[PDB]
Amino acid sequence: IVGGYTCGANTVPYQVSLNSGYHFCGGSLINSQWVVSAAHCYKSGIQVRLGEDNINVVEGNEQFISASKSIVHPSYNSNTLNNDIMLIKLKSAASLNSRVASISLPTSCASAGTQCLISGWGNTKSSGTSYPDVLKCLKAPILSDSSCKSAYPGQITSNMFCAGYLEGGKDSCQGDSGGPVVCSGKLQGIVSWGSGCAQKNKPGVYTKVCNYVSWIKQTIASN
Numbered sequence: 457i458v459g460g461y462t463c464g465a466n467t468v469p470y471q472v473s474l475n476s477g478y479h480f481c482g483g484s485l486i487n488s489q490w491v492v493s494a495a496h497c498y499k500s501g502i503q504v505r506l507g508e509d510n511i512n513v514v515e516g517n518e519q520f521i522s523a524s525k526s527i528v529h530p531s532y533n534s535n536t537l538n539n540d541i542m543l544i545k546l547k548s549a550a551s552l553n554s555r556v557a558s559i560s561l562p563t564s565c566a567s568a569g570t571q572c573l574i575s576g577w578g579n580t581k582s583s584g585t586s587y588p589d590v591l592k593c594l595k596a597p598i599l600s601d602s603s604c605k606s607a608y609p610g611q612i613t614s615n616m617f618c619a620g621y622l623e624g625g626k627d628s629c630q631g632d633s634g635g636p637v638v639c640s641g642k643l644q645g646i647v648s649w650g651s652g653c654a655q656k657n658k659p660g661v662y663t664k665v666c667n668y669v670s671w672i673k674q675t676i677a678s679n
């Protein structure tokens with residue numbers, strides 16, 4: 457996250473870290489056994505870390521749970537990042553408490569101008585590299601589809617939206633991928649892509665979760 461703030465310990469209780477020997481992507485806990493992330497975060501041998509604030513220190517609230525299966529969206533296109541969404545099932549159920557809690561899926565798509573909360577452990581610089589150990593947060597509005605398509609001509613599908621600041625300076629970034637965009641207390645987006653981080657006229661692009669709710673519900677009910 458570039459230009460954001462320190463969330464504060466366990467104030468984003470649905471945020472997870474995906475760990476393959478190191479943190480590599482974020483995700484969101486949607487119930488006690490399932491995490492949503494980005495398909496471009498796929499790898500084998502994922503461990504899901506819940507209840508994290510400082511990813512480099514054991515603080516006492518964490519639950520570390522191996523993934524039993526990963527399900528990438530059947531229409532995911534790694535070239536265009538269309539349908540950049542994946543489900544991860546945990547080998548055993550998480551214990552839900554005040555520090556580890558699920559986020560609701562949307563019944564409805566969010567509106568342009570809605571302020572959302574984006575979070576993660578990704579790079580905090582627009583130029584250069586500095587990774588935080590504690591969870592960072594950013595509030596950002598959803599942009600109109602026309603300003604989104606203007607920013608990334610020919611690259612925005614109906615399964616994507618833009619959120620951020622056309623002036624630049626504030627954005628998600630590498631390492632935030634897979635993480636939550638929460639608007640009005642529902643998961644509306646997944647950190648997906650963008651051109652650099654926090655660049656002028658290049659806002660963040662997010663998977664539009666409201667398009668996937670049927671697939672998520674059907675998949676969880678059969679796996």
Ligand SMILES: [Ca+2]
Binds near residue numbers: 508510511513515518
């Ligand atoms: Ca920790």
